[PDB]
Amino acid sequence: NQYDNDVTVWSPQGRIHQIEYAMEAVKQGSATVGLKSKTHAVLVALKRAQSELAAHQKKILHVDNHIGISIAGLTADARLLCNFMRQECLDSRFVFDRPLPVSRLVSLIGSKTQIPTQRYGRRPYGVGLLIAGYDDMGPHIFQTCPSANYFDCRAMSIGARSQSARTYLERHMSEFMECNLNELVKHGLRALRETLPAEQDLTTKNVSIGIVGKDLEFTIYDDDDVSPFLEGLEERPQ
Amino acid sequence: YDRGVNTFSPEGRLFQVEYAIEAIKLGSTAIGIQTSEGVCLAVEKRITSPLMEPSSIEKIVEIDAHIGCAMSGLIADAKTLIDKARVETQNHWFTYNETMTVESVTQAVSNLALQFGEEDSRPFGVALLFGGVDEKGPQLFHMDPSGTFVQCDARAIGSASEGAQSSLQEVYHKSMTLKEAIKSSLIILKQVMEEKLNATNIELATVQPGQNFHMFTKEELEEVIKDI
Amino acid sequence: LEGRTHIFKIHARSMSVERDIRFELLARLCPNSTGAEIRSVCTEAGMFAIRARRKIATEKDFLEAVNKVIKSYAKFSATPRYMTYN
Amino acid sequence: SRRYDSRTTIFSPEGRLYQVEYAMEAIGHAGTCLGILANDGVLLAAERRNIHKLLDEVFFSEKIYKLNEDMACSVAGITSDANVLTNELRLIAQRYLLQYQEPIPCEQLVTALCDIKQAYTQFGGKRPFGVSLLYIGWDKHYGFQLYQSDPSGNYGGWKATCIGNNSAAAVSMLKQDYKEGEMTLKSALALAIKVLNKTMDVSKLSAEKVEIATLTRENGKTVIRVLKQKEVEQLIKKHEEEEAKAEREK
Amino acid sequence: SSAGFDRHITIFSPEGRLYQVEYAFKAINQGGLTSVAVRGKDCAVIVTQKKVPDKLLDSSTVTHLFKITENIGCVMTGMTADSRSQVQRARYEAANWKYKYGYEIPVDMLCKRIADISQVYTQNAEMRPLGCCMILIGIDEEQGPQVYKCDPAGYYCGFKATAAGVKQTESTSFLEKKVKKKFDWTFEQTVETAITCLSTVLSIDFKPSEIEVGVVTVENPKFRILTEAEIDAHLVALAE
Amino acid sequence: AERGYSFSLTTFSPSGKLVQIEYALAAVAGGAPSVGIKAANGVVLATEKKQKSILYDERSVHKVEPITKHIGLVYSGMGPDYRVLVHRARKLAQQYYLVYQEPIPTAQLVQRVASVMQEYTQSGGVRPFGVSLLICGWNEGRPYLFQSDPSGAYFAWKATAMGKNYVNGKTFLEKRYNEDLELEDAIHTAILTLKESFEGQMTEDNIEVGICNEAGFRRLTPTEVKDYLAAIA
Amino acid sequence: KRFDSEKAGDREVQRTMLELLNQLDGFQPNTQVKVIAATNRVDILDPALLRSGRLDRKIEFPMPNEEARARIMQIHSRKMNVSPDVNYEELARCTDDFNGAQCKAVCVEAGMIALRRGATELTHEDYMEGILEVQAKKKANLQYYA
Amino acid sequence: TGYDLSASTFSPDGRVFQVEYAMKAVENSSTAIGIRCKDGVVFGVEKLVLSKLYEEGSNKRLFNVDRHVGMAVAGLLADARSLADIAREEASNFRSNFGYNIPLKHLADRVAMYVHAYTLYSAVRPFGCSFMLGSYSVNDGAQLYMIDPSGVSYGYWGCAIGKARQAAKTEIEKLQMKEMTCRDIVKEVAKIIYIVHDEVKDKAFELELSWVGELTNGRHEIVPKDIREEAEKYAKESLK
Amino acid sequence: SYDRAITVFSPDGHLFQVEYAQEAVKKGSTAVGVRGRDIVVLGVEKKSVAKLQDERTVRKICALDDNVCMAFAGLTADARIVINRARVECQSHRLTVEDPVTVEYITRYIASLKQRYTQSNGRRPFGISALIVGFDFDGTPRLYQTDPSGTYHAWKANAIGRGAKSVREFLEKNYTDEAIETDDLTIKLVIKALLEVVQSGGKNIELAVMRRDQSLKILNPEEIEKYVAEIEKEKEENE
Numbered sequence A: 001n002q003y004d005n006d007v008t009v010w011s012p013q014g015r016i017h018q019i020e021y022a023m024e025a026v027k028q029g030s031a032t033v034g035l036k037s038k039t040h041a042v043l044v045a046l047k048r049a050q051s052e053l054a055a056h057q058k059k060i061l062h063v064d065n066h067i068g069i070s071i072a073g074l075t076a077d078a079r080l081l082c083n084f085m086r087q088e089c090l091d092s093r094f095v096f097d098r099p100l101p102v103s104r105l106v107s108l109i110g111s112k113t114q115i116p117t118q119r120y121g122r123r124p125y126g127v128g129l130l131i132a133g134y135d136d137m138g139p140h141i142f143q144t145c146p147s148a149n150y151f152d153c154r155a156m157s158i159g160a161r162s163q164s165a166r167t168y169l170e171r172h173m174s175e176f177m178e179c180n181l182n183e184l185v186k187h188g189l190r191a192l193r194e195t196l197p198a199e200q201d202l203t204t205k206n207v208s209i210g211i212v213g214k215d216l217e218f219t220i221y222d223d224d225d226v227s228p229f230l231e232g233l234e235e236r237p238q
Numbered sequence B: 001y002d003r004g005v006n007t008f009s010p011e012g013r014l015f016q017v018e019y020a021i022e023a024i025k026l027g028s029t030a031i032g033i034q035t036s037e038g039v040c041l042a043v044e045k046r047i048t049s050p051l052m053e054p055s056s057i058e059k060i061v062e063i064d065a066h067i068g069c070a071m072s073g074l075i076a077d078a079k080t081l082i083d084k085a086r087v088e089t090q091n092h093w094f095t096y097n098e099t100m101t102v103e104s105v106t107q108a109v110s111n112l113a114l115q116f117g118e119e120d121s122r123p124f125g126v127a128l129l130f131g132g133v134d135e136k137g138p139q140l141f142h143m144d145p146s147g148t149f150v151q152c153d154a155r156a157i158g159s160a161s162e163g164a165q166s167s168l169q170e171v172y173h174k175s176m177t178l179k180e181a182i183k184s185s186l187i188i189l190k191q192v193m194e195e196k197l198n199a200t201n202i203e204l205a206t207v208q209p210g211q212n213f214h215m216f217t218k219e220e221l222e223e224v225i226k227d228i
Numbered sequence C: 001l002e003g004r005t006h007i008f009k010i011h012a013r014s015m016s017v018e019r020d021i022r023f024e025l026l027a028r029l030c031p032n033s034t035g036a037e038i039r040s041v042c043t044e045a046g047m048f049a050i051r052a053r054r055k056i057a058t059e060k061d062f063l064e065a066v067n068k069v070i071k072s073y074a075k076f077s078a079t080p081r082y083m084t085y086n
Numbered sequence D: 001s002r003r004y005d006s007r008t009t010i011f012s013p014e015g016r017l018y019q020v021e022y023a024m025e026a027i028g029h030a031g032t033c034l035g036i037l038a039n040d041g042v043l044l045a046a047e048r049r050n051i052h053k054l055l056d057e058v059f060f061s062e063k064i065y066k067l068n069e070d071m072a073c074s075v076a077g078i079t080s081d082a083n084v085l086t087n088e089l090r091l092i093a094q095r096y097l098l099q100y101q102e103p104i105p106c107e108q109l110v111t112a113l114c115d116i117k118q119a120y121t122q123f124g125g126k127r128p129f130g131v132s133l134l135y136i137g138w139d140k141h142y143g144f145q146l147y148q149s150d151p152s153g154n155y156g157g158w159k160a161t162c163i164g165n166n167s168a169a170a171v172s173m174l175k176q177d178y179k180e181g182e183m184t185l186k187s188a189l190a191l192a193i194k195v196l197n198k199t200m201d202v203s204k205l206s207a208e209k210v211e212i213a214t215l216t217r218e219n220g221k222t223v224i225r226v227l228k229q230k231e232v233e234q235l236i237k238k239h240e241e242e243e244a245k246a247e248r249e250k
Numbered sequence E: 001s002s003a004g005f006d007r008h009i010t011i012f013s014p015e016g017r018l019y020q021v022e023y024a025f026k027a028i029n030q031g032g033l034t035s036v037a038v039r040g041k042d043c044a045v046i047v048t049q050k051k052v053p054d055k056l057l058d059s060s061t062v063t064h065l066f067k068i069t070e071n072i073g074c075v076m077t078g079m080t081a082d083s084r085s086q087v088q089r090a091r092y093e094a095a096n097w098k099y100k101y102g103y104e105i106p107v108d109m110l111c112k113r114i115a116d117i118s119q120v121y122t123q124n125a126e127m128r129p130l131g132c133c134m135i136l137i138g139i140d141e142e143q144g145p146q147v148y149k150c151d152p153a154g155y156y157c158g159f160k161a162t163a164a165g166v167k168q169t170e171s172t173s174f175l176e177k178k179v180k181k182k183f184d185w186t187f188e189q190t191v192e193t194a195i196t197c198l199s200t201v202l203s204i205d206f207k208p209s210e211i212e213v214g215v216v217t218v219e220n221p222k223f224r225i226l227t228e229a230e231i232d233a234h235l236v237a238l239a240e
Numbered sequence F: 001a002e003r004g005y006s007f008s009l010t011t012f013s014p015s016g017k018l019v020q021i022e023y024a025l026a027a028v029a030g031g032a033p034s035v036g037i038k039a040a041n042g043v044v045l046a047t048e049k050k051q052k053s054i055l056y057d058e059r060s061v062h063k064v065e066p067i068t069k070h071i072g073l074v075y076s077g078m079g080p081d082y083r084v085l086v087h088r089a090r091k092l093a094q095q096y097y098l099v100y101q102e103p104i105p106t107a108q109l110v111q112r113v114a115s116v117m118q119e120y121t122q123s124g125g126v127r128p129f130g131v132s133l134l135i136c137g138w139n140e141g142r143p144y145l146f147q148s149d150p151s152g153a154y155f156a157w158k159a160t161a162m163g164k165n166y167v168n169g170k171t172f173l174e175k176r177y178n179e180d181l182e183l184e185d186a187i188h189t190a191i192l193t194l195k196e197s198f199e200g201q202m203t204e205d206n207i208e209v210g211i212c213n214e215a216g217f218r219r220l221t222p223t224e225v226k227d228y229l230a231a232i233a
Numbered sequence G: 001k002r003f004d005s006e007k008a009g010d011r012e013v014q015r016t017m018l019e020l021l022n023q024l025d026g027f028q029p030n031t032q033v034k035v036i037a038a039t040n041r042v043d044i045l046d047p048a049l050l051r052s053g054r055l056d057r058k059i060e061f062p063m064p065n066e067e068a069r070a071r072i073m074q075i076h077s078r079k080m081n082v083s084p085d086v087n088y089e090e091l092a093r094c095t096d097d098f099n100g101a102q103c104k105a106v107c108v109e110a111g112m113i114a115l116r117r118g119a120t121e122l123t124h125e126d127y128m129e130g131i132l133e134v135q136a137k138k139k140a141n142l143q144y145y146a
Numbered sequence H: 001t002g003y004d005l006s007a008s009t010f011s012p013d014g015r016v017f018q019v020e021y022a023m024k025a026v027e028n029s030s031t032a033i034g035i036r037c038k039d040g041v042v043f044g045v046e047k048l049v050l051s052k053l054y055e056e057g058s059n060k061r062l063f064n065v066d067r068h069v070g071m072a073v074a075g076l077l078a079d080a081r082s083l084a085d086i087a088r089e090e091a092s093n094f095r096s097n098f099g100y101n102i103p104l105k106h107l108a109d110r111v112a113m114y115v116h117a118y119t120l121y122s123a124v125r126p127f128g129c130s131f132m133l134g135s136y137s138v139n140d141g142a143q144l145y146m147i148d149p150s151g152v153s154y155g156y157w158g159c160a161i162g163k164a165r166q167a168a169k170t171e172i173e174k175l176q177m178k179e180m181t182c183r184d185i186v187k188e189v190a191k192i193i194y195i196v197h198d199e200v201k202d203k204a205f206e207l208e209l210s211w212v213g214e215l216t217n218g219r220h221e222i223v224p225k226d227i228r229e230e231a232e233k234y235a236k237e238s239l240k
Numbered sequence I: 001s002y003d004r005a006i007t008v009f010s011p012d013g014h015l016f017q018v019e020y021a022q023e024a025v026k027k028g029s030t031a032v033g034v035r036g037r038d039i040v041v042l043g044v045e046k047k048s049v050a051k052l053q054d055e056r057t058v059r060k061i062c063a064l065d066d067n068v069c070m071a072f073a074g075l076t077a078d079a080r081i082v083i084n085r086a087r088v089e090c091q092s093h094r095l096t097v098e099d100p101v102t103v104e105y106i107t108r109y110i111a112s113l114k115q116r117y118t119q120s121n122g123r124r125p126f127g128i129s130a131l132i133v134g135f136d137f138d139g140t141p142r143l144y145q146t147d148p149s150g151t152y153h154a155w156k157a158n159a160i161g162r163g164a165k166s167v168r169e170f171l172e173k174n175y176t177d178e179a180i181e182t183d184d185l186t187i188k189l190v191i192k193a194l195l196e197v198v199q200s201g202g203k204n205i206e207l208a209v210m211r212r213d214q215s216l217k218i219l220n221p222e223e224i225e226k227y228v229a230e231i232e233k234e235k236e237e238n239e
C-alpha cells in the first residue's frame, strides 16, 4: 500500500487511478444527451436541485453564438475554463473577426488540461462539457473527459446511468440525421426519459434543452420554453 | 492514505473540501426566508457566557447598499471574503455607473468560489447567504464551500440546516404572506436555542425596496423577542 | 440526526426521567457519538445526580456536563475514524 | 512531498516546539559561559570544548568573539553556525552607525538578532540556530546591560545567566553572591575564579583552556581589556589565596 | 541501514552510504554494452560494438560512435537515452571554448567542467542521476594523445588506458600486464590489443561490421573513423 | 509545506546532534590520509594518492589544488562536490583581492568559505560536503595551517592529520613533531606519519608533498618527492 | 518462497508443492493422473512451475465482456426462475469490472426485494438496479464535491 | 516497497520503474505502425470499434506536424496532441530562423531531449506515447525513426507499437518494399491488417493510412479512400 | 507510527493547529483586566520571577500609542515580531490621514493578519493571543481580544490562564452596575487577585491605569503599595 501513495505512480497494470477517480465525478452529474443531425443539432441536459424550494441548477448555457454547451462534474474548474472559454471566443472575433471552428477550438482545451494532469500535486479537471457548434462543414458533437480526449460524434450521453440513452441512441441516432428541429427535440427528450426513474416526472423546469443551427443562433430554452417540446408525446410503457 | 488532499481520492473527491463542510458543526446556524414583499433572515449568535458582547459578533453583513449577506461557521474566514466583496460592487458602479444587483455579485464570488491550491491557498468552510433586491425585486441566493452556486430562495445553514429546512421547505408555498413567515421563523429559532431568548441572543436581517437602509435597526430587534 | 433519540428511548426507561427533557436538543450537540458516547450522557446524568445528592436529572442538568464530556474528551483525541484507514 | 517533510517548523502534539526542544539540548551541552553584575565594568569568561592543548590558539579571541571594538559577545554553540549571525549582527550594528553615527544600544541589538533566528523557526522549515550567545555593552540611558539569546527566537536577557552545563556548585553560590556589583575590578574577577576552579571537570583552573575579557567603561573610548593570560595566572592565584583564606574560617 | 522514507528519495543514509547512486551500477547492465580505451605513443584507439537483434537495424542510426569535435570524439555506455542528453552538453561547452578561447580545448581539464554539469544532475533535489558513462579522447600540442573516461558521480577521471563498465573489469586486468613490464605502442599495436584485452573477457569473434573501433592518431589532428574497410584488415593482421 | 524547493533536510536528534552532517565525517574517516604541519618558516602538506590499478598515471590528476599563488591546500575523504567549492573559492577570493588590493590571508578564506559551507549544510535537498579542508599559506609574515570539517567548524593545529586512523597519526604528530622545525625537517615527519597507514610501497606517485614557503606556495613535482623520500623520511 | 527465508507460514506446502513438482521431474511414470491447479492472483509465482509435467496451459482471465457478463448471469440462473421482459442489452453494457459472482448477487438482491414487493415477477430495470447496487461500492452518495 | 514512487529515483534492480510502467502503457493502446520505402515513408493506424463508437474519421492518431514530417502515434491521445503541438512549435522555430525543411534526424533529437527530460523529474511524469517519425526529401531521402518513452533516439526500416499482434509486419518481407514505388505499397500492407487481430477480441475495427514521399513531392497527407481507391480495394480480396 | 494531518483539518469536527494553539494560549501567563468610565485597569502574573533578574526585560505590556495599550498572553518570542510589526502598522497609520480610525482598524489588523497567517502555505499559526487595552474617544473605554482563528471580540472582563485568574473576573461581576465610584477599589481588585492568582508572591503582580485621555504610567510601589493595604482592609469590612 506504500506504492499507491503518490500521483506519479503508475499502477501494476499501468493506469493512473487519479483520472479514473475524476471519471466518477462526471458520472455523478445529471443525465444529458447531446446530438446533431446532418442539418441542425440539439443538445438536452437535466437540471438538479438539493432541496424542493431550491431553483433547478442550470447546465446548458450559451457561450459562442453558434456554439452551445452543457456542463457536468466539477463546477469550479468548469467556471474557470468558462472564463477561458469566453476568452478564445472574443480572441478570434477580435483579431481574426471570425469565430473558431470547434475542431481546433477543443484542441486548446485538451492541451490546457494536460499540465494539471502531469505535474505533481496538480489535479485533473472533471468536465462534462458537450459542445455543439457550426463551422463551414456543419455541426459537430464532441465530448470532454479528465483524460482530455475529445471524440467527434453525432451524439453522446453522459451523467448518471446515461448509458441507457446510448442504447436508445445507437439505433435511433443513425435515423435522427434527417429529422427537422421540431420532432428532433421531442425525440431528444425521449432518450433521457428512461435515464430518470420511470415512476416520476420529468417535469418542465427540471430539464435543459437548446438548439443551434447554421443560420440559427443558439438560444437557451428552459422552464416554459420546454412546454412546446414536452407537449404531444406518448408516455413510457409499464 | 492522505494524498495531497487535492488529489481526487479513491471515492473520490477533495479531502480538505470534505473536511471544511464539517467545520460548520463548530459554529452557529441561520435561517433564510424570501417573499415578494421582502427578504427576512434570522440567526443565533450562540452566546456561551454573558461576557460576550452582542454587537461584537454579527452574522449578517451588507456587501452592497441594497445587497445583504450572511456568513457561516467561523467569522474571520468570511471576513476576508466579505470585505473584499465590497470592493467588487463599488468598482462595478465606477465602470458601468450602476451597482451589482443580486447577480453580478454571485458570479463575482462564484469565480473566486474555489481559488485554493497547494502549488501555484486553503479553502474556507464558510457558507454564504446572498440577499438583495435586483431589477426583479427582492431575491435571496445561497452558495456552499464546495463552490457550486445553486439558487435557494429560503435557505438555512449551520448544523440545523438539515432540520430547519425540512419544515421550511413545506411552508414556502407562494400563498404565504411575508408576515406569516416572520413569525414562522422564530418558532424554529426558540427550538434551536438552549438559552432563553434575550436582546443579545439573536439578530434579524430584513431588506426591502421601499424601506431602507435597513440593513436593520436598534430596539426593533427586541420587539420580535418578547413576542416569542 | 433523528436516530440519536432512539438510543435515548431505551435510556428513557433508565432510573427516573423528567418529562421536560428533550432528546432532540442534546442529540445534535454530540456528533458521531453512536450509542456508546451517549450512553455516558444518561450515565453522567445519574453520575452527577448522586454526586449532588439529587434524585432525577433534568435535561439542562446533564447536558451542561455533556457539552463538557464531548470537548474535554476531545482534547487528547477527537475520536476520528478517518485517520485509521488514512 | 508531504511524507518527506518532517514538520520541523510545525509544532509538537504536546504543545512544545518539536524542533526547539531538541535544539536546546545542545545548548545545555557544548558551550559554557557566565555573567554577573559589576560596577564600572563588566566581565565575561568561557571554557572551551576545544580545550585540548594540541591547538595553536592563534585565533586570540575564539569563544569570546568580539563583534565591534566597543562590544564583545560570548558564544555557546557551533562556531560556523554562529559565524553567520556574527557578521550579520555586526552589519546590523554597522548599518546602525551608518544612518545614525552613535553606538547601537544593547536592547534593540538583541531583538534584531533573535528575530533572525526566529524567522527560520516560523517558516521555511530551515534548520534553526542552536547558538545561544551573551551580550555586553553600555548606553547613555540604562548603562550596563546583560542579555541572552534563545533558539526559539526569544531574548533570554537577564542580569545573570547559567550556561550551559557545569558551574552548578557556583550557580546556587551566585544566588548567595547576588550582592549587586563592586570594583576593584580584580575582586569581581576573583569571584569568577572560584567559579572556574571549583566547578571545572578536571578542576585545577587550567589557564590555557579559559579566557577572560573585560569591558571597562571609559569616555569616550570604552576600553575593552582583553587579558593576555599572563595576568590571568596571577588572577587565578589571587583568589586561590583568598579561597585558601576563605577556608581558614571553619 | 535505512530509516524512514530515505529509500524513496535521493540523499544520504543513516550509515552515510548511498542507495540510488549505487543502483546506477547495474543501470548499464540493461544496455549490455562494452567500451575499452587503449592509448599509444602518438595514437589512441577505442573499441566498441553494437547488438543487431533484427535485420531492420540501420548501421548509421544505431551507430554508438559520437563525435564531439572534429579533433576530439567520444563514446558512451549504458542506456543510450541518458547519453544523448549529455552529448549536446559535451558539444555545448566545447563550442564555448572554441568561441571564447579559440584553441584545442581543455584536453586535460575538460572532464572537470563536464562532470560539474554531471554533478549538478546528481546534486539536484529530485532528478535522474543520468547514469550514462562519458568517455573522451584528446589531442594536445606535443603532449601526445589523451584518453579520458568520466563516470556520472560528478568527478573527472582519465588516464593512459581505462576501461570501466559491466565486463570492463576483466579487460583492464590484461592491460595492466600488457602495457608494463616495459613496452612501446604503435598505430596497429594499439588496434590489435583492443581485441586481445577484450579477448580475456568474451570476444565472440564475428563479422567486424557490428563492432566499431574508434581511432585517433596524430598526422592530421582531426579525429575521424573509417567505414568497414581496413578495420577488418587490422582484425586479420593481429591473427597470424 | 511551501514549495518543494529543497527546504532544510537537517533536523536535530533528541540529544541535539546533527544527523547527516556527522555521517559526512564517516566519509572523512573512510577516505584517504592527508597530513599537514605548521612549523617555523612555512607550512608543509603531505597527502596520499595510490592508484587502484596499474593503468592509472598520477601525472594528470593532482591532489594539491592551490587556491592562490601563496596559498596551498589539500583535502580528505571524498571530488565531485569538492571542485564545486574550490572554483567557488576562486571566484570568492577575488572580491577581497579587487576591493582591498591584497594577497588575502588564509584566515579570511576560513571565515568566508566556512560560512558558506555552513550555509550549504543548512540548505537541504543537497548532501553536505564530505570534504575536510586543510587551509594553509603565508600572510603578514607568519604562516597559518587551519583545518575545517563538514560542519564548518574551523580549528588550528601545528601538525594535523585526517583520514583513516587520524587519531593515531595525531598522537604521532603530537610527539614526533613539537615546537617548530624547518621545512626540510617538516617534510621528514610529514612523510613518516603518512607512511603509518601507507602500504609497503612508496614511490614518487604514491605520496606528494606540498610546501608553503614564506615567498608563497610552491608545489613540488614528483621528482623532488622521490629524491627526498626513497628511502622515505 | 519469500526472498529472505526461513520461513513462511506455507512451509509444509512450499516443500510439498516443489515436491509435487519434483516427482513430476525425476519420475516419468508420474505423467499419469493429470493435476489441475488454480490461483486467485499472479503476484507470487514460482519460476520452477514451468515444465511439461508442471503448469503448461495458462490463460489470463480478465473481466468478461458485455456479451459474456449478460450470458453468465442468465446461465447461472438456468437452475432457477428467469424473469421475462428482458432486453439483456442494457444490463450488459452497464456492467464494467463487475464480477460474475456479483451478477449472481444481482438476481439475489432483486429476488430479496421481491419478498417485500409482494410479486415474484421481475422487470428488466431490476437487473440494472441490483447491478449498480453492489458496485461501485456502497451505499453513500456524492455531496460536498461540487 | 515504494521504490516506484519518485520518478527521480532508481530501483533495487537498477532501472526506472516509471519507464517500465510507461512501456507497457503504450502496448494497451490500439496498434499504430510505420514503414519506409525507397522514395517514401508509410504510416498506419488502427481504429477500434466497440459499440459504434462515433463518427468515422474522428480523433485519428495520424497527425501532420510539418510539410515533410508526420506523426503516427500510440498510447494516450491527449499526451500525443501535446507532443504534436511541441513538434509543431519546434517546426515553427526552424521555418522561422532558417526557413527550409527541418531534418528528421534532429527533429527527433529535439523531441528525444524532451521526452527524456520529463522522465528525469518526479514533479512531472513520463510519457505514455510511443510514436513513429519518418520523412522523405529530394536532398535527404526516406528515413524512419522509432522513439520510445525512455528517450532513446534511433530508427529502423520499420517498427510496430500498440497491440501485440505484430503479425501485420511479417508479410512485409514477403513483398517488395524498397524495390516498390510506394504506390502499390499502400494496399500491400493492408492484407494481413484485416486477417490478424481477430474479431473475438474486438468485433469491428477501422484502418487509417498515411504516406509521404516523392509522389507527393515531399508533402504529407492521409491517402483518401476514394483516390486512388486501391487501398481498401485490394485489402478485401487479399484476406485469403 | 505517527499519523496526523496539519491544515486543514480533520473530519472529527475540530481543527488541528488552531484549537491546539489555544492550549498554548491557556498555558500562557496569567493576566486579567477590566474596563471603566475613566480608569481602566489590567494585570499580569505567573512570570516566575526569581528576584535575581531585571523586571523590565520580562515586561508583558507595551504601548503602540499613549491612547492604546497592548496586553498579550503567550511566549515572548513572537512578541517583538508583533511589536515591530504592529508599531509600524500604527506608524504608517499615523503617517497619512492624521486622525486615526477608531478601534476598528487596529483590532482587525492583527486579527485578519493572523487569519491570513493561517491561510497561505509556509506560514505557521501563532500559538499566542492578545487583548487590546485603552480608551475610545469621547471618554469611552476600549478593549478587545485576538483569537487563533482571527475573530475579534470585546469582553466585559478578561479571564485567562489558570482557574485562579478566572476568579478575578468573577469578583468584577459582584460589583454589579454602580461599582466602583472611586478608583481606589478598582485598583484594589488587582491587589486582591494578587493573593488568589498564582503563588501570591506580591512580586510578579504589575498594573497600569489610564484615566480618560491621560497616558498611563507603570505603578510605582507607593500608590499600589498603599492600595495593597486597603485591599485586605476592604475585604475585612465585609466580615
Ligand SMILES: Nc1ncnc2c1ncn2[C@@H]1O[C@H](COP(=O)(O)OP(=O)(O)OP(=O)(O)O)[C@@H](O)[C@H]1O
Binding pocket: C007, C034, C035, C036, C037
Ligand atoms: N446505535 C446503537 N444502539 C445500541 N448500542 C450502541 C449503538 N451504538 C453503539 N452502541 C454501544 O456501544 C458499545 C461500544 O461498541 P464497541 O466499541 O465495542 O464496538 P466495536 O466492537 O469496537 O466495533 P469494531 O468491531 O468495528 O471495532 C457497544 O457495546 C454498543 O452496544
